[PDB]
Amino acid sequence: PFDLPALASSLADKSPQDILKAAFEHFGDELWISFSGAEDVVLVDMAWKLNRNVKVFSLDTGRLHPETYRFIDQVREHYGIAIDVLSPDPRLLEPLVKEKGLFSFYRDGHGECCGIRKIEPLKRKLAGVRAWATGQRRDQSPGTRSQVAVLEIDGAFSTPEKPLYKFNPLSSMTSEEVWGYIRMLELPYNSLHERGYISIGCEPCTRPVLPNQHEREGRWWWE
Amino acid sequence: PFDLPALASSLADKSPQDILKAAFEHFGDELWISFSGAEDVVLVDMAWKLNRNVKVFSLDTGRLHPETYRFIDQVREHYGIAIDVLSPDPRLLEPLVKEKGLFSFYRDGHGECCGIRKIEPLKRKLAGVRAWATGQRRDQSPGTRSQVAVLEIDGAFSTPEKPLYKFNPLSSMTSEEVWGYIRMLELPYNSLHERGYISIGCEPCTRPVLPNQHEREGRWWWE
Amino acid sequence: FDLPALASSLADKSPQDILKAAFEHFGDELWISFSGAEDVVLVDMAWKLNRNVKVFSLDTGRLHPETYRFIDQVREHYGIAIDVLSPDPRLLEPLVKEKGLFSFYRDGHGECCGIRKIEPLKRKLAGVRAWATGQRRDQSPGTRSQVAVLEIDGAFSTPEKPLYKFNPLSSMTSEEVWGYIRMLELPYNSLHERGYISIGCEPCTRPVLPNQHEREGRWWWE
Amino acid sequence: FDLPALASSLADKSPQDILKAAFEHFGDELWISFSGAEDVVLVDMAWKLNRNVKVFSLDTGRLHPETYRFIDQVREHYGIAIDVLSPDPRLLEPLVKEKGLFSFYRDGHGECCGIRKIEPLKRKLAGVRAWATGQRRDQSPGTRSQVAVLEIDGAFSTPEKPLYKFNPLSSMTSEEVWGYIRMLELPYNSLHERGYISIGCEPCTRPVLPNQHEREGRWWWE
Ligand SMILES: Nc1ncnc2c1ncn2[C@@H]1O[C@H](COP(=O)(O)OS(=O)(=O)O)[C@@H](O)[C@H]1O
Numbered sequence: 037p038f039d040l041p042a043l044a045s046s047l048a049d050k051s052p053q054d055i056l057k058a059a060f061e062h063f064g065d066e067l068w069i070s071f072s073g074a075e076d077v078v079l080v081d082m083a084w085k086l087n088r089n090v091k092v093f094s095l096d097t098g099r100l101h102p103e104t105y106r107f108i109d110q111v112r113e114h115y116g117i118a119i120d121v122l123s124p125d126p127r128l129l130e131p132l133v134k135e136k137g138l139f140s141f142y143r144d145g146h147g148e149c150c151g152i153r154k155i156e157p158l159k160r161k162l163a164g165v166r167a168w169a170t171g172q173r174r175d176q177s178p179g180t181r182s183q184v185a186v187l188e189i190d191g192a193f194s195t196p197e198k199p200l201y202k203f204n205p206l207s208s209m210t211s212e213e214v215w216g217y218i219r220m221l222e223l224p225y226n227s228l229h230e231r232g233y234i235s236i237g238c239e240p241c242t243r244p245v246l247p248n249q250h251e252r253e254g255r256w257w258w259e
Numbered sequence: 260p261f262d263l264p265a266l267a268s269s270l271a272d273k274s275p276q277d278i279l280k281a282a283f284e285h286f287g288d289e290l291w292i293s294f295s296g297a298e299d300v301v302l303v304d305m306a307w308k309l310n311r312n313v314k315v316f317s318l319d320t321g322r323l324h325p326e327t328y329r330f331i332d333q334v335r336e337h338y339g340i341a342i343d344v345l346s347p348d349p350r351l352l353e354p355l356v357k358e359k360g361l362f363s364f365y366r367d368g369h370g371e372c373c374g375i376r377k378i379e380p381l382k383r384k385l386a387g388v389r390a391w392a393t394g395q396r397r398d399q400s401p402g403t404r405s406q407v408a409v410l411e412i413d414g415a416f417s418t419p420e421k422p423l424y425k426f427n428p429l430s431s432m433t434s435e436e437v438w439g440y441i442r443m444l445e446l447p448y449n450s451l452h453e454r455g456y457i458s459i460g461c462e463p464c465t466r467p468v469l470p471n472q473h474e475r476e477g478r479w480w481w482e
Numbered sequence: 483f484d485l486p487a488l489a490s491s492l493a494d495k496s497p498q499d500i501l502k503a504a505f506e507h508f509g510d511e512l513w514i515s516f517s518g519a520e521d522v523v524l525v526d527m528a529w530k531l532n533r534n535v536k537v538f539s540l541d542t543g544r545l546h547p548e549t550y551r552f553i554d555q556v557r558e559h560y561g562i563a564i565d566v567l568s569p570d571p572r573l574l575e576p577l578v579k580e581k582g583l584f585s586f587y588r589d590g591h592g593e594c595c596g597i598r599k600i601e602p603l604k605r606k607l608a609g610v611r612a613w614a615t616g617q618r619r620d621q622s623p624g625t626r627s628q629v630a631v632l633e634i635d636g637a638f639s640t641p642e643k644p645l646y647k648f649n650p651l652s653s654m655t656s657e658e659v660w661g662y663i664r665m666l667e668l669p670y671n672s673l674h675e676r677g678y679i680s681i682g683c684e685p686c687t688r689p690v691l692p693n694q695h696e697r698e699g700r701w702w703w704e
Numbered sequence: 705f706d707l708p709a710l711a712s713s714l715a716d717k718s719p720q721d722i723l724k725a726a727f728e729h730f731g732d733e734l735w736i737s738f739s740g741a742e743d744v745v746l747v748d749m750a751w752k753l754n755r756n757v758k759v760f761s762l763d764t765g766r767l768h769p770e771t772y773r774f775i776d777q778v779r780e781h782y783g784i785a786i787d788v789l790s791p792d793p794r795l796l797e798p799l800v801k802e803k804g805l806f807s808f809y810r811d812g813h814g815e816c817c818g819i820r821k822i823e824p825l826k827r828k829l830a831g832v833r834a835w836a837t838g839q840r841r842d843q844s845p846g847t848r849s850q851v852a853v854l855e856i857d858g859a860f861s862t863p864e865k866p867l868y869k870f871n872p873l874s875s876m877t878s879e880e881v882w883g884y885i886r887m888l889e890l891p892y893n894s895l896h897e898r899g900y901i902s903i904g905c906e907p908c909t910r911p912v913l914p915n916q917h918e919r920e921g922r923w924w925w926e
């Protein structure tokens with residue numbers, strides 16, 4: 037049924053689980069959960085607790101850590117969730133590698149490669165979608181402040197014609213809270229977290245951070 | 260120009276470099292070199308030394324050791340070869356992972372996954388191809404004897420209509436000789452060779468092997 | 483000198499100021515204990531106040547190879563002939579004979595540390611007037627006891643013959659320690675890039691998960 | 705007993721037959737040297753001939769953590785109270801003081817090894833009638849001196865007071881060693897699964913490439 041963006045104002049401070057219920061209400065089993073094989077496993081845990089038939093997809097860029105592959109499959113055989121593992125389109129990837137190597141992002145910035153292995157296939161998925169949710173968090177951002185809202189129009193894949201709504205349940209959640217959650221209920225997590233990795237991306241563009249170092253500095257550090 | 264399969268009887272004992280000259284003679288810049296990011300790097304060195312314009316491709320199953328990606332790119336920047344890195348077809352892969360996970364080969368045998376990530380895209384390549392060479396070696400096989408000939412008709416992708424010739428330069432070259440070669444001319448080699456790896460496949464289906472243990476036992480060991 | 487006077491004045495002063503106090507009163511006889519971890523900050527600060535700063539490390543013979551490498555790197559870097567002390571085979575041998583090499587897993591680190599660290603420490607400190615350590619209040623979840631920037635070492639000194647102990651970094655925080663490390667581009671243990679915050683011996687230390695307290699990475703089974 | 709006679713008779717016999725010989729003449733006074741590597745074969749064989757088999761290991765204090773775990777795993781497995789010996793701080797401390805922790809990189813493993821292995825070895829063997837090692841002709845690229853299955857230990861015994869040394873695996877080859885290991889499912893160092901064939905201290909050992917000789921992974925810089 038119809039609604040207004042004022043809902044996004046209503047769910048501003050509501051707990052993540054409640055924000056999820058909201059989404060599950062309006063969009064039912066049509067809500068897709070974006071799972072990156074990282075601490076966002078919490079979003080998968082909450083979502084799955086509310087809905088045992090929750091739909092979730094992971095963007096396999098073909099360059100994920102072997103640890104991340106093992107984990108995604110783990111969350112799969114743990115919650116009984118046939119995850120949608122999306123791969124890149126060769127006709128897009130192949131030419132890129134061909135003239136630029138398998139590490140162009142080091143000299144051309146991560147933009148291009150991401151766009152082909154991550155962004156493009158994501159766009160393709162969200163097409164036949166009404167709304168989806170990601171575990172993005174306010175605090176996992178440098179500190180430019182809190183830019184993420186719990187509910188908003190997907191300003192990247194949305195069109196006045198075919199609008200796409202996006203939920204960010206873990207927006208107001210802190211890293212410490214995320215880990216308390218995962219540790220408390222003993223959720224499975226990426227092995228990389230026991231090696232100095234807070235923020236997890238693709239193997240070649242992600243590195244561990246030092247004690248007290250912000251998690252974002254473990255991503256595209258050369259940039 | 261035309262030739263007879265007696266040539267395959269001729270090159271039998273000749274050195275790999277000769278077999279490559281022979282190959283380059285008949286098929287020229289059209290002869291493709293299959294590069295797996297492993298000790299077959301020797302083939303690349305030999306072919307490239309003869310033909311600085313040598314064409315080469317590698318099948319990126321989307322599940323290679325990060326060590327492998329870094330190597331393939333090294334050979335690329337080391338020799339000055341715009342290698343062709345081939346990726347799997349989403350429309351073929353995605354469905355497999357959806358209902359079986361990312362480690363099905365552990366219980367269903369490796370055949371199916373290899374078929375989609377490795378074999379299929381290999382076929383799509385050898386299409387517009389007259390002949391190609393791989394670094395397959397006799398001794399790199401368990402011991403069911405020497406089954407590889409230096410030259411033969413591709414018994415997997417060749418057809419009476421459109422034939423495909425395949426060379427195996429390193430056929431008669433022993434492991435010791437392959438490494439004596441690489442170490443001698445100081446070629447670059449996969450970092451994994453320093454961690455116990457002799458034979459290198461994808462990350463999930465490859466494990467290092469013990470002292471004296473055969474190099475084939477580090478591949479699909481569960482089968 | 484005046485223990486109570488100094489213990490008070492120094493209380494809220496900077497680590498550098500505490501070290502200036504220590505060197506001023508004990509000079510080239512103030513020993514700096516270096517465990518091959520974040521306390522490198524202590525070594526650095528002390529080294530800048532006194533190039534000749536005596537320093538020593540307890541080699542329990544079970545440290546992470548990364549720690550052996552780091553300690554030496556510090557040695558070479560600042561040009562400090564660190565005194566790397568080892569266990570007494572006459573004490574360690576019988577312990578390993580009977581209980582093996584990982585007894586501390588079932589008996590608690592008490593015994594082993596007693597023989598590999600403490601006893602060799604006692605011998606060293608025994609012929610010393612004063613020493614310092616990188617112990618920070620910050621390192622324990624602030625329990626019943628806190629670190630004194632200056633104090634009488636109750637553990638290794640007789641009422642009649644006292645030993646003084648300085649903990650300059652007492653009030654410095656983890657974040658401040660690392661900011662210092664990173665800002666001044668100091669050299670640090672490699673383990674710190676693999677999830678290790680606190681750094682003990684290889685068998686009794688483990689990296690910690692994000693946000694997990696650093697002390698939760700030492701003798702975790704206890 | 706008859707050294708020359710026995711050295712000859714044993715020459716071509718099996719490793720077990722050589723251990724049987726050693727035990728028969730020295731019983732519970734024959735020490736088996738275990739370094740935490742493939743020599744586990746020697747331990748397994750000797751253990752099966754004599755459960756009470758004395759066994760010792762030289763803890764240079766710089767061994768691989770994996771080696772520490774393995775040595776203890778063997779201990780626990782066969783139920784052997786292995787004698788893990790350590791260096792003499794009165795000798796090591798001053799070496800590390802002056803030269804640091806990696807002097808061997810620039811002076812050659814001589815001096816260090818001399819203090820962390822040899823010196824403590826001598827002491828041990830000083831009150832021993834005979835011992836045995838896992839040394840094999842196979843381990844060195846067949847140089848000027850080979851391994852006698854039995855011999856006088858000229859290195860550690862005075863002409864008047866001799867010491868006898870047995871090398872049961874003298875003639876056993878790497879390939880055979882591992883077949884034995886894998887066949888009887890013996891426990892082995894983890895570093896074997898990481899490219900290590902020969903295994904010494906962490907800083908002086910390194911894995912070898914395929915077909916590269918195992919000795920090339922020890923003191924490679926020399
Ligand atoms: N490759 C991916 N596959 C699935 N979900 C993803 C992927 N990347 C990001 N996400 C979503 O976005 C959040 C993590 O985003 P990031 O990985 O932090 O974005 S990134 O651009 O920096 O890589 C998670 O809460 C997750 O739901």
Ligand SMILES: Nc1ncnc2c1ncn2[C@@H]1O[C@H](COP(=O)(O)OS(=O)(=O)O)[C@@H](O)[C@H]1O
Pocket residue numbers: 292293294295296299302316317318319320377392393394395459460478
């Ligand atoms: N995925 C691949 N991409 C490119 N070349 C390959 C690939 N796999 C095998 N080859 C070629 O075949 C040889 C290695 O074959 P293998 O990897 O040993 O075959 S396999 O069946 O075990 O995977 C090398 O000399 C190499 O040229």
Ligand code: SF4
Pocket residue numbers: 097099141145146147148149150151153154237238239240241
């Ligand atoms: S994170 Fe790096 S490897 Fe991954 S998609 Fe972006 S550019 Fe490519």
Ligand code: SF4
Pocket residue numbers: 320322364369370371372373374376377460461462463464
């Ligand atoms: S080696 Fe394993 S991971 Fe790679 S293609 Fe074959 S089945 Fe799949």
Ligand code: SF4
Pocket residue numbers: 542544586590591592593594595596598599682683685686
């Ligand atoms: S920390 Fe562990 S290994 Fe090190 S001295 Fe203490 S008990 Fe022994």
Ligand code: SF4
Pocket residue numbers: 764766808812813814816817818820821904905907908
């Ligand atoms: S092998 Fe290296 S570290 Fe070990 S005793 Fe010898 S020189 Fe020292």
